[PDB]
Amino acid sequence: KKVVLSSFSIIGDITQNIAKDLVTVTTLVEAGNDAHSYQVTSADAIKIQNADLILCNGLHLEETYMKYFTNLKKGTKIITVTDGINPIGVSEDTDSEPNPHAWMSLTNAMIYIENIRKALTALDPSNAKKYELNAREYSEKIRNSILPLKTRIEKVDPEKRWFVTSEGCLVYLAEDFGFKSLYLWPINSDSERSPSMMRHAINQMRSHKIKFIFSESTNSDQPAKQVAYETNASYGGVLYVDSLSKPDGPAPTYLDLLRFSLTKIVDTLF
Ligand SMILES: [Mn+2]
């Protein structure tokens, strides 16, 4: 039985839905661990050795631990599951390093799925028909759950078309649905979170009468709450974007993560 190692929980879950136990699906950065800054352990290095295929996000998500994907099993490829996604830069001024959060998007969910289907099929061609069926079923499950939320979201008055968060985690969602983005820092890892970016967000929220700003499940709510105060806006609560929740939490699968976060967003806009 083949072993397919996913870099983090969101990719591992997508992969499990496509492979359904035809391969063993492992995960490097388990849920609750940070995919932006991770220390590969000795046990993790076993997972890396056992991998017949390695599935990474790319868009520099894994940049600080790519060095551990070395001394690999002969024939083991590293696949970038965001291939075909046009990158969005980390500069709020449009060039720069890529924003990695491409999975927060309905269109892109379909691309992650297709890339993973394609890679599994190249790895394990005797099961091509099963990966084919499974990928389509899962794509449809995603669409069936998430499309109605998009449909709701698209009714928003153009003046209110803003997703404002702490980390720049919704830039791909904004692009997918036709909203503008505002945030406090591009990526949670960066230890430099800047006064200028906070000042800018505050000024922009005032300018555009933006009513809500969120924080996320792996960062502090304190900046968002402060910005809310300074802008006469409201704190919108906690989104799930960077990791699956614990099994008994609200976002234990990728579909549940998208569904939770987009539900919470649309419940703010109306
Ligand atoms: Mn993040």
TrEMBL record:
Origin species: Liberibacter asiaticus (strain psy62)
Any single GO CC term annotated in Swiss-Prot or TrEMBL for this entry: cell envelope
Keywords in alphabetical order: Metal-binding, Signal, Transport, Zinc
Presence of keyword Nucleotide-binding: no
Residues the record lists as binding Mn(2+): 36, 101, 167, 242
Protein name as it appears in the record: Periplasmic solute binding protein
Localization: Cell envelope
InterPro entries noted in UniProt: AdhesinB, Bact_metal-bind_prot9, Lipoprotein_PsaA-like, ZnuA-like
Record PANTHER family: HIGH-AFFINITY ZINC UPTAKE SYSTEM PROTEIN ZNUA-RELATED, METAL-BINDING PROTEIN HI_0362-RELATED
GO term, biological process aspect, one: cell adhesion
Binding site for Zn(2+): 36, 101, 167, 242
Main location class: other
GO molecular function: metal ion binding
SUPFAM superfamilies from the UniProt entry: Helical backbone' metal receptor
Recorded family membership: Belongs to the bacterial solute-binding protein 9 family.
Keyword Transport (UniProt): yes
